[PDB]
Structure 1
Amino acid sequence: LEAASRDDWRCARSMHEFSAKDIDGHMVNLDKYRGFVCIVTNVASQCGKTEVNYTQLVDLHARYAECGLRILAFPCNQFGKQEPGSNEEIKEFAAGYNVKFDMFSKICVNGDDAHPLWKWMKIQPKGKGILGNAIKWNFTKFLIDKNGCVVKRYGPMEEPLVIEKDLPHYF
Structure 2
Amino acid sequence: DWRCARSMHEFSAKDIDGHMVNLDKYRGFVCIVTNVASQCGKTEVNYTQLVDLHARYAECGLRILAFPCNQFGKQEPGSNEEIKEFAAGYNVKFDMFSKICVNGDDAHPLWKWMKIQPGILGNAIKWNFTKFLIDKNGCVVKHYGPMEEPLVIEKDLPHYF
Q: By how many angstroms is 1:131 displaced?
A: 6.7
In structure 2, stretches of 5+ residues that fail to align are: none
Percentage identity across paired residues of the two chains: 99
4+ aligned runs moved over 3 Å, structure 1: none
- CA pair 166-130 structure 1, distance change in 2 beyond 3 A: farther
Q: CA deviation at 1:13?
A: 1.4
Q: Secondary structure at the match of 1:45?
A: coil
What runs of 5+ residues in structure 1 fail to find an aligned partner? 1-7
TM-score, normalised relative to structure 1: 0.92
Whether 1:164 and 2:121 are equivalent positions in the alignment is no
CA gap 1:130/1:94 in 2 versus in 1, 3 angstroms: farther
Deviation at 1:165, TM superposition (A): 0.3
The RMSD of aligned alpha carbons is: 1.3
Q: Deviations over 1:47-76 (max 9, x none)?
A: 000000000000000010011100000000
Equivalent position of 2:113 in the other structure: 120
User: TM-score scaled by structure 2?
Assistant: 0.98
- Note the alpha carbon deviations across 1:141-171, whole angstroms, 9 max, x for none: 0000000000000000100000000001111
In 2, the alpha carbon distance for the partners of 1:15 and 1:130 equals 20
Question: 2:29 maps to which residue?
Answer: 36
Q: Does 1:144 align with 2:134?
A: yes
- Alpha-carbon spacing, 1:99–1:130, altered in 2? closer, same or farther (3 Å): farther
CA distance in 2, matches of 1:119, 1:145: 18
- 1:132 deviates by 1.0
Map Cα deviations across residues 55-100 of structure 1 (whole Å, 9 max, x no partner): 0000000010011100000000000000000000000000000000
Distance 2:129 2:107 in 1: 16
Shift of 1:130: 11
Distance 1:15 1:86 in 2: 26
1:17-44 residue CA offsets vs partner (Å, 9 max, x unmatched): 0000000000000000000000000000
1:3 maps to what in 2? none
